Each structure stands twice: as structure tokens, then as C-alpha cells.
């Protein structure tokens, strides 16, 4: 039973066939009882208390029933005011000291009403990945970070160990996409207002991982059950070690929500002394921006790292150089009938983006020969070309709806993407290029770069419409992903004309 | 944290800068310290200990950090032998005394929310069998297994008597009980994934479910009446919740023995304990004797050879096989046994593919009675029989040696039939399988090869964990062309071609440049709804055309038909301009099999052509072509 310490923990003990009450003592070495007859020979001994030393008779291997549990141990008979159960008999039972926290009590964590914890089965993993994951997870449990569970917890979220940088050390990720979606209500209680709009203008934004901060702020107990994962074993030989997170997770939506007030305390000196720095955070990462020369930007990066580690926490990204790629139209010296047909087929699609497009002259109509363009078609077409080569119009951000990221392949080591909130009206358009290599790596790098830009510019990961079979992605997406977050993706099985349209 | 009392439970204590350690004393009502730095004023106090009494200096509102937990409380300073953390500061923290555990541990189990069952009136039995029920019950109780609850428990579940052969074995129907149990975590170990071990034995646990205790607090939900209410205290012999807790208990009890013996490898699925080691048999029997004694320690009972029967796989000195799996046969089968035979077929599905019992499962699931002789369908029964006839095939294989790489190989039999031969040495199959089309509507052979590789890789990572080196048949030039030109993203791990008389290739290509002199042919299509009154044709550079009335006129069908009409009357080098994105998309995927003989006719036609080039136009626009039959429908 669990005994509160408001009162003395005396328990019924049976000695030499007798019912009596002995006080369980945690600071008592041996066991001292009242004067009574004990079987076998005894040895004269003395014990020190808070008043001096008393003469006691030592009886070894003596039978005692503590709280109805049999114990055989040395028993000391002496002139003691309180019958006492010492650690010597307490160990035989296995009496233990159990500890709770007084100063810090995790803030409650809640779910959207009528929403159960995530139940998403884990996809298979490679042998080296599981071999390293076991090491990482067991080391974590050795430091008290996670505790193993049985079968009473039906929830589960997938896991995969990755390598973020060139450093030869794996780190695990938990796909909390379902848990973040379920616990979306707990974000509404705490909004980060305002999101920094100055990061969009910085000359250099450095991403510093601050995941380790959450390891010191424990979770509200009733929600611990929801964070469970299984590290499966090859060939399903051993069933699979299922743990629960005791400290806060990394990818959980509330993981920074709990730590927001705690951290901003630590950042107060920094924002106090150099306002031109904009420091903004996401699920695991710290973005620090400074529209300075890179020489001292890198200088304050080091000082920020030292400041963070001093209080116990722990390619380059350039928003200015980021540019919006327009759409261009061919202007061959002598086009042929095929070229006008293709150009019209492309252009009539463009009206869904730039409304001020008129082609009625162009469609005015061999295809082995050139057809010189008519003058009124010339002028109208040029006017349209000017219109197309101008910033997009009548578009802005509605923060009430999520964001959609659509990637389309150009098939020569190049990629193009469109970032939109509603169809035919796109926020950001750009290309990704890297010059014969692997193919899945290209989308994964492209997805990561899209999401980094999206985090900087509108501060949330959009929903992807990937150009790959779901079966293909589910196998080799984790091979080449270096990022703590995970974006929501849906799979596309229709080739449109947009791929030919854009580039 | 939990602290054992084997040595004194000292914890770190910090007094305003001062580091030091104090002894957590449950008996020491007050916290007593040898010294405090610069404490200043203190009221005199008298405290008693074992031997006499002592004057002490009392300090109030002291903020002290004990073992990482803050406490603000009175701290005494006196001539104590050791620093003493009293119950006064212990209650500021949460420290409590846990006392001796009993025998074993019980995994906590709870019901699904918002449920207060179960309750089903047991259809009263008769005395001849009731005698058997009583006889079982008395001995079961004296074994400390099932206890006669108090009549205050209000629930009941049925019990039947079964001969256990095809004599009145006990069974309790937990069909309604399973509907309220909380969910629990529930693959299969393939024979292909057993490493060679020169000494092998398989031990069966002597009904070990009768050794792992069930929740004493959950026992209220598994009563047992004989029409004398009883109650299970260990795992039910048929509860679907039992396997999980049984496996968990087996793991927890095996962990120490495994720990003290890293060399041995121990598996356990249902009742078998596959123990293997490379030690000599003379040594291995002694080590297995150690294993059995340790198993008995925790209350488990162990009952009481070139073949070995492990999980239905027959282990052999250098090979493995599956004991032929067959079913009982009768005109009508016992319903509960049918609930067993579905499980046996389910298990055989992993060993041997081509097993579907979904209809048989539905016929059972809808039915919930035993009094009426349950009718069985002839169609699903014949499906079962034909499935069994295929199930007459002895599998084989050999043990995996990780020192040698896997080498797979796929071969194209025909029209959507493939092979999955896997091996590490020639002519020693590790596992053999077959693959067929999944969509069944539109596909191509190269895409099928890629999908087959994907399936093989998934299965291989499941079984052994390392992806293999495929030996595909396709030519490398063809694979590179298709992967560089196809719109989607596909990868194949390291592989080499292997030359076989059948091979995979892309039959045809669609040209990327319109062809000089080729009779460019314009096509168009439309359809109606009230009477399917839409017609098709083509319009040509010279103006030849034909509109032939069509039945079951459908818009996508018409768009397809427009191309074929022209392709039939076209020579070698052709250009086709179509106003359908859909027809263009279907054609240009370079498919080879489709449910449409119209699509297949186009494929066979286009095979003959030498230079075919397709382009697209916007609809409902005048582009100087189809205007000749723009008036087709309106």
C-alpha cells in the first residue's frame, strides 16, 4: 500500500506469535522492538539514537509479519519507546521511498472534444536504423526521459531515426502529425502574436536547433499515455518495445507552447540589448535574423549560442536573395504553325492567373513552313507579354485557411513549385535545381526547402501534393530527410499541363 | 525515484549555497542538521533519540533543496550523528513508503469507456454434462484458479462442453465480453528468417495461461454459472485479450535468463519456446535444463529428434518446410470449429498465398446462434475447396546466413504474372512468390516491374531487414529511358540485368517532333446524355473523314474513339491532334494492357506505325482545323 507521511507509518507486525504495531522507520538501520521473549541465542550490542546509546539483545533470522508480509531478519530487543521496523527488514519486504514534485506541476493538456489519441501503425525500418534507435531510446530511459509501457495503451505514433547534419550520430523523430492535429485546440489557448514579419526582410536567418530545451519541463500526467511509440524488431521476433514520453516531446504542437513563457524569459536580455535581431521559434528550431553584414551576423550567432548554453539550453538561408520567378514566352525569329498552336495552348491557361489576357488576334489561324505573324497580333501579343512579366495581382494572405504546396517535376534535374492557398492564385513560385543523381533525394530536398521558406515567410508548414506514388514515398522518404518537423502530404496521380506551362 | 534500502538513503541537500548530504529518515519526525552556515538566531528545543535526549537549535522557514525537490520548513541544528531529513520536510516533498510486493505482477486492464456489461443468460444445460462441469470446477478451484464469487456479482456467460476431438472440455463464450475490453497492441516469424544453430530444441509451456495471473479487480466480468457462480483468476483459455498479456509476462520473465546468456536465442509465439544455440548438445541440454528450472521458478510449468515442429514449421538439419495443413471435412461443420478453421486458414495465408475467406467470415459474423444447423453456401464452400487444392503444395527453404548477401530475381511469365525467387546461393530458394496486377485497368510492364521491386523490398525489409540486390530482366537502356522520361519519381536499388528468353521492353514511343510530310490528322469528339447521341470521326489535311454511328456513346469513350478511327486509316508516319486531355493522357502513358479492347486495338494498331506524334489543342476554340466538323453535335 502507499502510506502518506502526514502521520507516523506504524503497521501491524506479528512477533513470536504476537500481534503488535511497529513504526516503519526509513532512517533506522537495524530493527529494534520492545522487550519480549525471542528464540535462539542473542548477542549484546549498542545502538546510537538522537539521545545517546542503548543496550540491545541481537536475535538473528527471527520471524516477523509486517503488514501481513513474512520477513526473516536480525531483530534487536532494547529499551526503545517505539517498536521500529528498520531498513534491514524493510528491504526484505522491499519498502521504498517514492518521490513527487512540489514547485513545478505541468500545465494541463487537453484534446478536442470527441477526439481519441492517435492510433497509427509504424512502417518497417532498416536494420541499422533499428540497431541505433535501440541505443538511443535505452539511453533515454536510463536518464529518466521515457518509461516503458504494456499493452493497455492502444495509441501509437511512428518513429524513425535520422541524421540531421554530417555529424555521425543518429537522432529519432516521432511523426506527431496525428497528435498535433488532434491537440490543435491546445494551441488556441496560446497564440504567438504577432508573428515576426521582419524575418521576411532579413539579410541572413540562421536556424539553431533548441529541441533539448524541452527535456527539463515534464508533461501533465494524464496526457503522457498519448505519446507512445514502438521500435519494431526485424521479422517480428520480439514483439516490440513500446515506451511512453515522460518529458515533453519534440514534434508535439504543445511542446513549444509549454516552453514559450519559460524561454522568452531567457531571451529577455537579448531582445533588450540588440533590437534589430528578430528571434522566432518553431517546433524545434530558433530562427535568428540580422540585416547586417554577414561578418558580424555570424559574430552574434556565436554569442547567442553562448548565451543559450550559458543558461542550460542548447548552404545559408537568405530571404533577401529569395525571388519570385515569372513566366516567359518564346520569341523565335521564325516560328512555325506548331509553335503558335503550342503557344496558344499555353497562353489560354494563363488567363486563369493573369486575367488581362486576350489572344483573339493570335488564334487567327503549312506546319512544315513558317507563318509570319500578323502585325495586330504582334502588338497584342507584345502587350500580353508585358502583362505576364509583372508582379502577380489581386492576391494576399487569408490566415483563416491552411496553405497548399504543389510540386511539379521538370525532368532534367530541375523542379518547379507553386505555393497557393486557393487554386489559380499563388503566393510564391520558384524552382529547385541541382545538377544523373538520385530522384527521391531531389523531392525530399525540395520539400525541405519549400517548408523552410514557408516557415520563414508565413510561419507554418503547408500541405503538399507530391508527385510520387505513396508506396514509393513511404519507403525512401526517411532515408534523406534532415529536419525535425514533418509536413502533411497528399499524393497526386494526374499529370496536368502545368508542368509544361511553367518552365 | 524508487530507492532500495540496501544502503543508507542519503540525498543531496543545499542550504543557501552550501552543498551537503542528509539521511532521509521516516522516523525522524523533524529534520536535524550538524551545522548551518551563518544561520544567526535560533530558539532552543529539546528532542529525544535512542539513548537519551539532546538540546537543538530550531531554524524556521529554511528553504532547502532535498534530492532535487524544494522544501521550505523548520530545520533543527543539533549534535546528530548523521544529517537527518525529518518527516516534516519529507511531507513537503512527496516521499512515501512502498512496502513488500507479493508474488508476481499483474498488468492493469480496464474496460472500454461507457460500458457496464457483460450479461447474457446462459441457455440452461442438462445434468449429464453438468456433472462434467462440476468435476472440472472442483479441481480447477482446488488448484487456486477459479473462485466461487459472492452472489452480489450480477453477470454471467455461457459454458459449453466439447469432446476436444473430431471429452466435455470446458469452454466459455466470451463473444460479448470481447466487445468491451480496452484495445491492446496486437507480423509472423517466417521460416526464412532463422539463422543456423547447430543445437536446437523447442519447449512447449504447459498451458502457461493458467500460470500468469489475471487482474483480480477485473475478475468481476468473467463469471461462470452451472445451471454455483465461479470466477476466473488467471487468463481465460479463449479470451482474445489473453495472448497479449501472456506474451508480455513471458517477456518479463525471460529477460533475466536471456541477459545472463547472450549467446542463446529464444523465440516464443503461442506456446513454443524456440531455444537455439551453437553449443554442443551435451552442453546444450544442460543449459536448457537451467532454462527449465528458471522457468519453473516463476510458477510456470514445463511438461515432462531430427524433426522439430515450431509454429507449424518443421525445422530440419539444413532445410525447412511446412507441415501440410489440412482441415476437417463434413457436410455441415460445427460452428465454433468453423470459428477455428477461419483462424487456421488465416494463418496459412501468411505461409501460402491465395487464401480468401471473407465471405465465410461474413456468414459467421452475421450468425450468432448454435441451435439451428447453420447453412453454408455452395459458392464459398467450393472456393474453400479449390483454395485447399492449391494449398496442397510443399514449401521449402533454407536458413538465412547474414554473412552472404541476398540476391533476388523476377521473371515475366505473361500478361500480369511474375515470380519472386529469393536466394543467397544458386538453386537454394530462400523464399518464392508471385505477383500480379493490382489496378487491373491501365498499366505497363515496366511500371509493373517497378511495383514488383517495391513489394519485394518491403517484404525483404520485413523479413531480414536488409534490402536485396535484384536481378531484373529489363535492359538498362530501356530502364534509363523510362525513368528519365516518365513524369513521376521511381527508384530501384542496386541491380543487374539477367538474360532470359522473355524480357520487358516499352513496345512503342510517341514522337517528340511533328514529322515532315506526315498526313497530320485532326480528331474531335462529343457525346450527349438523353439518348447517347454523340458521333465521332476525324478531319484530315486532305479532308478524308468518316463518321460512323456509335453505340453506348460516352464522352471519354468518344474522345478515345476519335483517335482510333483515324489510326485505322493511317499509314506509317502520322500526326494526330486531339482536343482531349484525357485521351492524350491515357495513350501517352505508354500502356500495354487495359480492360478496353478499344484501347487494346489502338495499342495493336500503333505497334504497326513507325512514327506517331500526338499533340493537344484547347476545346471550343477555332484553331483552323476541326472547323470542318465543328458543327458535329450542336
UniProtKB/Swiss-Prot annotation, chain A:
Reported impact of residue 345 to A: Complete loss of polymerase activity. 25% loss of RNase H activity
According to the record, mutating residue 266 to T results in: 34% increase of DNA-directed DNA polymerase activity. 18% increase of RNA-directed DNA polymerase activity
Q: Give the residues annotated as active site.
A: 25
| Residue stretches making up the Reverse transcriptase domain | 143-317
Q: What is the effect of changing residue 284 to E?
A: Strongly decreased RNA-directed and DNA-directed DNA polymerase activities. No effect on RNase H activity
Instruction: Enumerate the residue ranges of region (Dimerization of protease).
Output: 1-5, 49-55, 88-100
Quote the record's binding site residues for Mg(2+) 1. Answer: 209, 284-285
Query: What is known to happen upon mutating residue 164 to Q?
Result: Strong decrease in RT binding affinity for all dNTP substrates and in catalytic efficiency. 100-fold decreased sensitivity to ddNTP inhibitors
The consequence of residue 288 to I is: 25% increase of DNA-directed DNA polymerase activity. No loss of RNA-directed DNA polymerase activity
Outcome recorded upon mutating residue 340 to T: 96% loss of polymerase activity. 45% loss of RNase H activity
Q: Give, from the UniProt record, the effect of changing residue 283 to V.
A: 58% loss of polymerase activity. No loss of RNase H activity
Site residues by UniProt (Essential for RT p66/p51 heterodimerization): 476, 489
Q: Which part of the chain is the Peptidase A2 domain? A: 20-89
Phenotype for residue 284 to A = Strongly decreased RNA-directed and DNA-directed DNA polymerase activities. No effect on RNase H activity
Q: For the motif Tryptophan repeat motif, give the residue ranges.
A: 473-489
Outcome when changing residue 173 to V: No loss of polymerase activity. No loss of RNase H activity
Result for mutant: residue 255 to A: 74% loss of polymerase activity. 56% loss of RNase H activity
Outcome (variant: residue 255 to T): Complete loss of polymerase activity. No loss of RNase H activity
**Outcome of swapping residue 288 to A:** 37% increase of DNA-directed DNA polymerase activity. No loss of RNA-directed DNA polymerase activity
Q: What is the effect of changing residue 315 to A?
A: Complete loss of RNA-dependent DNA polymerase activity. Complete loss of RNA 5'-end and 3'-end cleavages
Result after altering residue 255 to G? Complete loss of polymerase activity. No loss of RNase H activity
For the site labelled Cleavage, the residues are: 99-100
Effect caused by changing residue 481 to L: Decreased RT p66/p51 heterodimerization
Phenotype upon changing residue 362 to S: 21% loss of polymerase activity. 16% loss of RNase H activity
Q: What is this protein called?
A: p51 RT
Q: Which residues of the full protein are shown?
A: 501 to 1027 of 1447
From Swiss-Prot, chain B:
**Marked site (Essential for RT p66/p51 heterodimerization) residue numbers:** 482, 495
Please indicate which part of the intact protein appears here, giving the first and last residue numbers and the full length.
Answer: 501 to 1152 of 1447
Q: Which residues bind Mg(2+) 2?
A: 524, 559, 579, 630
Outcome of mutating residue 482 to L: Almost complete loss of RT p66/p51 heterodimerization. Complete loss of polymerase activity
Q: Where is this region: Dimerization of protease?
A: 1-5, 49-55, 88-100
Q: What is known of its domains?
A: RT is structured in five subdomains: finger, palm, thumb, connection and RNase H. Within the palm subdomain, the 'primer grip' region is thought to be involved in the positioning of the primer terminus for accommodating the incoming nucleotide. The RNase H domain stabilizes the association of RT with primer-template. The tryptophan repeat motif is involved in RT p66/p51 dimerization.
Give the recorded effect for residue 275 to M.
Answer: 27% increase of DNA-directed DNA polymerase activity. 10% loss of RNA-directed DNA polymerase activity
This enzyme catalyses:
Endohydrolysis of RNA in RNA/DNA hybrids. Three different cleavage modes: 1. sequence-specific internal cleavage of RNA. Human immunodeficiency virus type 1 and Moloney murine leukemia virus enzymes prefer to cleave the RNA strand one nucleotide away from the RNA-DNA junction. 2. RNA 5'-end directed cleavage 13-19 nucleotides from the RNA end. 3. DNA 3'-end directed cleavage 15-20 nucleotides away from the primer terminus; DNA(n) + a 2'-deoxyribonucleoside 5'-triphosphate = DNA(n+1) + diphosphate
Q: What is the effect of changing residue 482 to A?
A: Almost complete loss of RT p66/p51 heterodimerization. Complete loss of polymerase activity
In UniProt terms, what is the effect of altering residue 270 to I?
54% loss of polymerase activity according to PubMed:9533880; increases polymerase activity according to PubMed:9657675. No loss of RNase H activity
Q: Where is this region: RT 'primer grip'?
A: 308-316
Give its localization.
Answer: Virion
> Per the record, what is the consequence of mutating residue 242 to T?
Complete loss of polymerase activity. No loss of RNase H activity
Give the residue interval(s) assigned to the motif Tryptophan repeat motif: 479-495
Q: What is the effect of changing residue 242 to G?
A: Complete loss of polymerase activity. No loss of RNase H activity
State how changing residue 521 to W affects the protein, per the record: Slight delays in replication. Virions contain primarily p51 RT
Q: What is the effect of changing residue 314 to A?
A: Complete loss of RNA-dependent DNA polymerase activity. Complete loss of RNA 5'-end and 3'-end cleavages
- Result after altering residue 384 to S: 59% loss of polymerase activity. 8% loss of RNase H activity
Q: How does it assemble?
A: Heterodimer of p66 RT and p51 RT (RT p66/p51). Heterodimerization of RT is essential for DNA polymerase activity. The overall folding of the subdomains is similar in p66 RT and p51 RT but the spatial arrangements of the subdomains are dramatically different.
> Catalytic residues per the record?
25
Summarizing the annotation, the consequence of altering residue 522 to A is: Virions contain primarily p51 RT
The name on file for this protein is: Reverse transcriptase/ribonuclease H
Q: Where is this site: Cleavage?
A: 99-100, 521-522
Q: What is the effect of changing residue 308 to A?
A: No effect on RNA-dependent DNA polymerase activity. Complete loss of RNA 5'-end cleavage. No effect on RNA 3'-end cleavage
Q: Effect of altering residue 271 to A?
A: Strongly decreased RNA-directed and DNA-directed DNA polymerase activities. No effect on RNase H activity
Task: Look up what happens after changing residue 521 to L.
Answer: No effect on cleavage between p51 RT and p15
